[PDB]
Amino acid sequence: NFTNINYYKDSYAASATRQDFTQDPKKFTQPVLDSIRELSAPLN
Amino acid sequence: NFTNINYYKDSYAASATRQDFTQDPKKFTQPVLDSIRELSAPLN
Amino acid sequence: PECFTANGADYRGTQNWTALQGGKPCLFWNETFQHPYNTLKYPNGEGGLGEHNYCRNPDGDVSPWCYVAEHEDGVYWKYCEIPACQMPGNLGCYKDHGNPPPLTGTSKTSNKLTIQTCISFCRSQRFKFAGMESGYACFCGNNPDYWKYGEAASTECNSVCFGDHTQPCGGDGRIILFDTLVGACGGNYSAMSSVVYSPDFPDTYATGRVCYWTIRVPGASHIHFSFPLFDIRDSADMVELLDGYTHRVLARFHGRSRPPLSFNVSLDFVILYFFSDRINQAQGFAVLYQAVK
Amino acid sequence: SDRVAQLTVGNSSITTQEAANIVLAYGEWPEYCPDTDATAVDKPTRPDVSVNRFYTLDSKMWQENSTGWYWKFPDVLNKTGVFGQNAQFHYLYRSGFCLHVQCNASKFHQGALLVAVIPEFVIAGRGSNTKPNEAPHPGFTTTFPGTTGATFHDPYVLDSGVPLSQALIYPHQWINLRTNNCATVIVPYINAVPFDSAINHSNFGLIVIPVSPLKYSSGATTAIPITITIAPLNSEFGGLRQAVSQ
Amino acid sequence: SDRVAQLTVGNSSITTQEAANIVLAYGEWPEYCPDTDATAVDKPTRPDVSVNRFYTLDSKMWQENSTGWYWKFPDVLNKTGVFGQNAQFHYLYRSGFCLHVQCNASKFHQGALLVAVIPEFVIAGRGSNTKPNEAPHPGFTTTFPGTTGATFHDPYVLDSGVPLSQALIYPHQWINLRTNNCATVIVPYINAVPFDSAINHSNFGLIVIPVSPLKYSSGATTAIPITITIAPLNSEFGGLRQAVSQ
Amino acid sequence: VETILEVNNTTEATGLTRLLIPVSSQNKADELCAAFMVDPGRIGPWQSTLVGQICRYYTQWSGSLKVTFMFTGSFMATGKMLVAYSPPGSAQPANRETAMLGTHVIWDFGLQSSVSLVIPWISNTHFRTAKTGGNYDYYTAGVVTLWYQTNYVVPPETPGEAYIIAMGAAQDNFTLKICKDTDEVTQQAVL
Amino acid sequence: ETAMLGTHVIWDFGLQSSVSLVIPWISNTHFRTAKTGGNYDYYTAGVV
Amino acid sequence: AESAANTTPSSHRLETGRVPALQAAETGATSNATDENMIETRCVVNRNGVLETTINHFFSRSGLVGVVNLTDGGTDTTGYATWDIDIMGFVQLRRKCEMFTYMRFNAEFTFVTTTKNGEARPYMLQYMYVPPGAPKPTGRDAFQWQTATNPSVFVKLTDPPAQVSVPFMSPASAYQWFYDGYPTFGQHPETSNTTYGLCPNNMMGTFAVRVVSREASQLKLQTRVYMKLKHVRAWVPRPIRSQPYLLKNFPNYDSSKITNSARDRSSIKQAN
Amino acid sequence: AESAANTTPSSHRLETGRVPALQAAETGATSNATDENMIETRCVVNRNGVLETTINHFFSRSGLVGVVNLTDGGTDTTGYATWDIDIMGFVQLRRKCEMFTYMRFNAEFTFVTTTKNGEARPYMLQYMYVPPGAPKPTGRDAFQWQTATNPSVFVKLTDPPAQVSVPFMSPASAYQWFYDGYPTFGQHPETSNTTYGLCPNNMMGTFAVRVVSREASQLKLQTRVYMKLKHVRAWVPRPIRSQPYLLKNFPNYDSSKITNSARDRSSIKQAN
Numbered sequence A, B: 001n002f003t004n005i006n007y008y009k010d011s012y013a014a015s016a017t018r019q020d021f022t023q024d025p026k027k028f029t030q031p032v033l034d035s036i037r038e039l040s041a042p043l044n
Numbered sequence C: 001p002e003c004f005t006a007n008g009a010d011y012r013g014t015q016n017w018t019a020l021q022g023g024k025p026c027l028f029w030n031e032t033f034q035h036p037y038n039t040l041k042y043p044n045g046e047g048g049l050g051e052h053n054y055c056r057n058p059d060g061d062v063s064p065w066c067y068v069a070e071h072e073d074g075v076y077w078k079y080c081e082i083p084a085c086q087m088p089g090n091l092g093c094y095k096d097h098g099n100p101p102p103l104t105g106t107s108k109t110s111n112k113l114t115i116q117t118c119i120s121f122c123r124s125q126r127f128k129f130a131g132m133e134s135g136y137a138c139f140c141g142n143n144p145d146y147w148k149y150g151e152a153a154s155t156e157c158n159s160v161c162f163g164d165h166t167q168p169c170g171g172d173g174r175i176i177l178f179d180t181l182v183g184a185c186g187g188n189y190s191a192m193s194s195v196v197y198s199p200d201f202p203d204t205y206a207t208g209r210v211c212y213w214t215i216r217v218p219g220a221s222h223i224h225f226s227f228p229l230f231d232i233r234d235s236a237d238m239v240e241l242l243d244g245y246t247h248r249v250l251a252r253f254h255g256r257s258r259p260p261l262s263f264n265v266s267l268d269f270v271i272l273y274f275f276s277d278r279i280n281q282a283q284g285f286a287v288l289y290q291a292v293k
Numbered sequence D, E: 001s002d003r004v005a006q007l008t009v010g011n012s013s014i015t016t017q018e019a020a021n022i023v024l025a026y027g028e029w030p031e032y033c034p035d036t037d038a039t040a041v042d043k044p045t046r047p048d049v050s051v052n053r054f055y056t057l058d059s060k061m062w063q064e065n066s067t068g069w070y071w072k073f074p075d076v077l078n079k080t081g082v083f084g085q086n087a088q089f090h091y092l093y094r095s096g097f098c099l100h101v102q103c104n105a106s107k108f109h110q111g112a113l114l115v116a117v118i119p120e121f122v123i124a125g126r127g128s129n130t131k132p133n134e135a136p137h138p139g140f141t142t143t144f145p146g147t148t149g150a151t152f153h154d155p156y157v158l159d160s161g162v163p164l165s166q167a168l169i170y171p172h173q174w175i176n177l178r179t180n181n182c183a184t185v186i187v188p189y190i191n192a193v194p195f196d197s198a199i200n201h202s203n204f205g206l207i208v209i210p211v212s213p214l215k216y217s218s219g220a221t222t223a224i225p226i227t228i229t230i231a232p233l234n235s236e237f238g239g240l241r242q243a244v245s246q
Numbered sequence F: 001v002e003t004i005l006e007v008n009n010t011t012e013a014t015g016l017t018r019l020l021i022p023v024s025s026q027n028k029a030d031e032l033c034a035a036f037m038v039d040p041g042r043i044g045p046w047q048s049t050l051v052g053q054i055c056r057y058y059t060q061w062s063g064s065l066k067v068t069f070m071f072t073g074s075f076m077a078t079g080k081m082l083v084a085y086s087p088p089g090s091a092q093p094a095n096r097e098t099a100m101l102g103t104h105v106i107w108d109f110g111l112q113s114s115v116s117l118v119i120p121w122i123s124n125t126h127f128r129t130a131k132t133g134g135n136y137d138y139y140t141a142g143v144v145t146l147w148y149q150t151n152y153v154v155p156p157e158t159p160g161e162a163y164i165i166a167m168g169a170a171q172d173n174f175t176l177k178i179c180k181d182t183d184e185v186t187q188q189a190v191l
Numbered sequence G: 001e002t003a004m005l006g007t008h009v010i011w012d013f014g015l016q017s018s019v020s021l022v023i024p025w026i027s028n029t030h031f032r033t034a035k036t037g038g039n040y041d042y043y044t045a046g047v048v
Numbered sequence H, I: 001a002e003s004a005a006n007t008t009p010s011s012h013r014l015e016t017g018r019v020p021a022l023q024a025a026e027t028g029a030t031s032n033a034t035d036e037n038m039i040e041t042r043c044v045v046n047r048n049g050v051l052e053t054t055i056n057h058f059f060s061r062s063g064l065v066g067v068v069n070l071t072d073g074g075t076d077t078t079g080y081a082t083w084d085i086d087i088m089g090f091v092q093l094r095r096k097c098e099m100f101t102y103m104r105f106n107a108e109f110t111f112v113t114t115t116k117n118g119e120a121r122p123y124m125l126q127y128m129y130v131p132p133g134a135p136k137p138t139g140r141d142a143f144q145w146q147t148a149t150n151p152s153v154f155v156k157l158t159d160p161p162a163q164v165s166v167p168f169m170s171p172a173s174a175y176q177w178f179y180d181g182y183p184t185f186g187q188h189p190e191t192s193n194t195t196y197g198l199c200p201n202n203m204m205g206t207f208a209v210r211v212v213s214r215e216a217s218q219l220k221l222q223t224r225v226y227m228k229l230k231h232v233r234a235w236v237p238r239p240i241r242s243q244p245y246l247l248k249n250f251p252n253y254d255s256s257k258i259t260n261s262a263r264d265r266s267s268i269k270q271a272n
């Protein structure tokens, strides 16, 4: 099982590299400045 | 003699893996709670 | 018209081929001792079984079928695509591709989906055309463009329904068409010659059904009646034909009465009445009429 | 201590009584261009007091049969003040924006507004013609409305073929007349190029669409204006030359 | 941080905006029966997820000439859901209850409701006859109203000969339409016996009586419903046998 | 990310008034408000959200969903609403005393004007197919029904007709698998 | 099929020719009155 | 994270002050109310994978991109067959790619060539990529087909389909499918703004193909372009289009005859 | 254990109390009486292997699974040829696989395509796998044949037969060939229970195939499906069927005309 081997001098001619599991969801779900707590009223 | 080498990232596309010699026959032959001895009467 | 039932159970035709263009011949009903449907088992009719090779329906199937010769490739029986076998109110089967449907309207899915439940679902919302496919579908709509995907064969759309097992509910990706006026309870009829079915015609008629079918023709001389299909197993429920000018009864037919197949009456305001009971229900009627100007 | 806020940029201030939390678009603050991502060689200018301030546009009367309004933000401040003058003389431009939409009413009015920003908000022509010479295209006053603004014809599709329902992925804020009377969005510079001309390219655009219609009983006020204030935060300009209008 | 509350029991949740503090009846939490006070030998069952949840009853329109309504709580949930099915099959029963009464209105309506619980709320017959054969007694639909409910005839005497004024000793809560829109009472198991049949004995009963009448000006809404939600906390069942209805 | 559900997708409606749930003052003590299916890969209100299209690009989904309601009425108008989720089984509940046996939340109209009913994962198997039609009713999810808890009371000189905006998103345990083509576009004009 | 929902024991005829059904105490209160008649059916025990 | 999310065991609460189900939607944020702050849940160790939902596993599909006809007649012949490299010709990959604003990726173009009636006769073809600025070949025997300082592929019809890898070659830092501006300065008209939305950062030259022979070859070929995206990065997610496409470089839709995003129902108080 | 079993040297016994040949069969257990507790045996070191009798070496056979006809006419043409993926069409692999209740494995589908008269002409075919829920292609020139977000194989007739590997994709934890239940709720009839035994956990989509050309190709192809099981695990062993099969998804047998499990003899007191 080895698909990280390239056959050319150029790097864009390879296959899919190591997968990245990064998942930042808070930049779309809570784009607010005051961090709203989980157990609180959002407005006071 | 090497057939344990896979050529893809997926694991189901390989060949037959190392053979397992496990043989539990007592779960079908003697499915009883009181272990019947070999030299004894099965009922008393 | 040759078939007045939704599955062609009463079709006494002269068709001895499976299809007219690109078909194989049918086998005779007396040379079929191998199969459990032959004339050695069923004498005196029983669906129509003589010394012919016609496409009959003795087993209560969804379409008439004959015995084809087995060519060591499986199929020993084929459905017969009879062009003149369609109840008046059956537009035919059509193709169904995707998100733009042939019938733009309401949709409904159920595990008990017959022809009359879908017709009633499309009728209770004032839709013009009903439609069903794959056994579990009810597509309503009022658009005139329902042949946008092409016309399909009648033998292709013979998937059995889920509620009943003697009716074709379209097929996988193939929708069968029905108008909502069939099986209704009364209606202002102003056509030249149409058919009037009992309430819940594809099913058996319900308990306590009573309605008034009205037929008016703007200037007809006299009207002609007919009785293709009539099956009543009781003497309490009965059909009547009345004239609404002075409100008198013309003729009263019931289960113990065999109606004449054809007669003329010099009226133009005939109204039909059907008083059902709650004891015994077997099947309805298929009264066809004709007005000569 | 959350419903009150005073934003101060330059010599302007915005006080509030009925406010929700401020929205920071994509979690990124608007900053200056770093040397790693920059590509021009000439040194850019940074007034930081003369163009970074709250500019108030006109007010639009929110009626009952209203569809909605929209704007091209690097093109609305193209002629108003020191910012517009400084943007006409320069070829390159890069800044963020701070927004504030005012809409107040009584406790007897009902309604809701959806204010959001759409990067590269492309206006689509309306028609069913596929011939190249008669295919409808929006005019210049429709693509770039200027300081006045433009109205929607089919606000259900955002005038672009994309449904309004799915437009909640953008940096958005609601103005519910029973909850708040303002909405605040801070958006950074969003583009695939470091600098860009602020005359023939609008980066994003505000849109205000009343989802719930304005309703009130006979006897209350009938003029409900829609006011918008914009602060061009962290502005940069490059390529000084003659001043061009459009 | 006191006017908002979210009660979660099982797979149900009740959110609130206008709330007072929650009421804990007699300062005792509803718990399971200890081995010292118990008397049965068979092991009781505890679903704890299938019967411990918020069950919502019907809504009753609060009119202007309304007297009040009441309920027998171990008899209202006698036929609704897994709790009712599990209570029909068993002979013994012991649980507490969590209540919530919803009644919302605008800021232009006025009125007040008194919701409270009365352990062993016995309905009294109404009449002035002392002969044993004609002395009036309430019917079964009056003593046990079921999931629907029953109305008061003389709510000033609580339909029992005890004045409504002195009924403030019970675990009670007020619903003042200018202050809150809900009332919450948590009552434990109150009985002189450890277990008891939930079919022929109601432990307590809710009562809602409008003390201040509902008033409003011509032009506002006129349908004011009264909704009640009940959570059978810490339920136990014993004596499994055939299912009986009543 | 929450996205406005299209609950009023019926006929006799225009485009903009199609995302609003009408709320009025009912005279009878208990009536039924808008109701809709949970299945996101099914023809209905979920077709208008981003989660529905993303689940349409795939064929099997798992994890819990979230439906967030929002009251956009007047400030003086109060009331309580019952949002009840019911697991698969029989058809839509007829009355409230039947629908309140499932998963429900009492939502009152206060200063905060939004409730968020979570839809738990009560499936027998790990994944559900977005097909859910005819003989695929094995993978149905349930019915979310919004009932009137107390009433929609309104003071005088105040309109007595409000609206509720329904939003929908997915939780953190949301999982997708097996990529396929969507069925929102079948043909296309030569471009 | 109705009586087998309570407390029951299957007894087969073998070498030992005696079974002993225990009757447990499934009462609500601690003591039962031996009266058990008419309006005293509150203190009944059951049917074997 | 290789799995989705685990569930914490929960219980009931009887107390005032904590309201997790009253998340305000006016703030523009998404409700963060979990199941543990609600109906009593259990302990579930979820091991469902999230690898398939990534962007590199979502854009790793070829799809049809371009269809190029080559008649090569005898009296009405042209010889060559150029094809402007653009992705907006077929609405499947266009709908899959226009859900983002800025993208950056590589390509794995594949060419499947068939005959009119369908037949693989051993005819050698020449696939030429003409970069933007280079002269286009005019004729099957032109000077430009020498392919000096120009990449080209020689393959037959009986051979497997050709497949080359293409790097990121836009002069900007990323591609864009929506350009809210104009390509050049000047006065813009009010009648027909045919240059609005045009992005010069996407013109990736022209693709040409001929038949390598001397005299002629009476055969009508039909090439298909399959482009597999790889090493893709996307920014600023955009909603998915709900209207049918009408043009290639313009997102025009029908003003009348609008398509609703959801189909119609019988009543609002009905789930089915 | 790599060998079967060795034998211990035994001898005769003359004593009371030990009865190894009186194993009771009423207990439901199998008699565990060996040879050493009986007639005098010897010491044998058995080295016969047990590797071939394992499950992975027993299910590693391809066998015929499906036969798909493709006529591709000119006047009565269809173009495509779909095939529901099921194993119950041929009784050999069905009899080999229905001796267990629950199984879990992978597949190595192989497609052998021949002509009517038998001939390998260089015609390229397209094998498409349609998952359950995806639309089926209707026509040789349909929209679904683009194979965007859909796996497909392009191969010719002169090429070797194609061979792909298929993972375990049932929504349950294992397959099952016997489902004692109903797929949905409702009232079930007494006349014809045509939905009894149906398991929705086995519908593995549909397999389609067409001829990649422009106009037509007057040739009647006939594809054969060969599925090799691998990585297989079985549970709850079930007896082998002794009656001839009659239907595909139903284990129906003949009420009259019963087939005995053993053939008849002359007499019971006769071995031959």
Ligand SMILES: CCCCCCCCCCCCC/C=C/[C@H](O)[C@H](N)CO
Binding pocket: H085, H086, H087, H088, H107, H109, H127, H128, H129, H151, H152, H153, H164, H166, H175, H202, H203, H204, H207
């Ligand atoms: C040797 C022949 C190679 C054939 C392929 C040509 C190589 C250059 C391909 C560049 C890849 C561009 C992918 C898309 C670019 C732009 O976004 C589109 N033109 C606009 O949609």
Ligand SMILES: CCCCCCCCCCCCC/C=C/[C@H](O)[C@H](N)CO
Binding pocket: I085, I086, I087, I088, I107, I109, I127, I128, I129, I151, I152, I153, I164, I166, I175, I202, I203, I204, I207
């Ligand atoms: C690219 C073409 C591939 C052709 C093969 C289709 C891939 C999917 C095959 C799934 C393997 C399923 C094996 C048997 C499944 C069920 O048990 C049967 N349908 C019922 O007998």
Ligand SMILES: *[C@@H]1O[C@H](CO)[C@@H](O)[C@H](O)[C@H]1NC(C)=O
Binding pocket: C016, C025, C026, C053
């Ligand atoms: C069908 O019947 C007609 C009767 O006119 C006869 O002429 C014809 O030969 C028959 N064909 C077959 C195939 O039996």
Ligand SMILES: *[C@@H]1O[C@H](CO)[C@@H](O)[C@H](O)[C@H]1NC(C)=O
Binding pocket: C028, C030, C031, C051, C052
């Ligand atoms: C069946 O009937 C036909 C027509 O009368 C006749 O020609 C044929 O011989 C019959 N076959 C048998 C087996 O009697």
Ligand SMILES: *[C@@H]1O[C@H](CO)[C@@H](O)[C@H](O)[C@H]1NC(C)=O
Binding pocket: C262, C263, C264, C265, C292
């Ligand atoms: C009724 O009159 C018509 C004349 O139009 C005739 O054809 C028909 O046979 C008559 N019916 C009877 C029963 O004589």
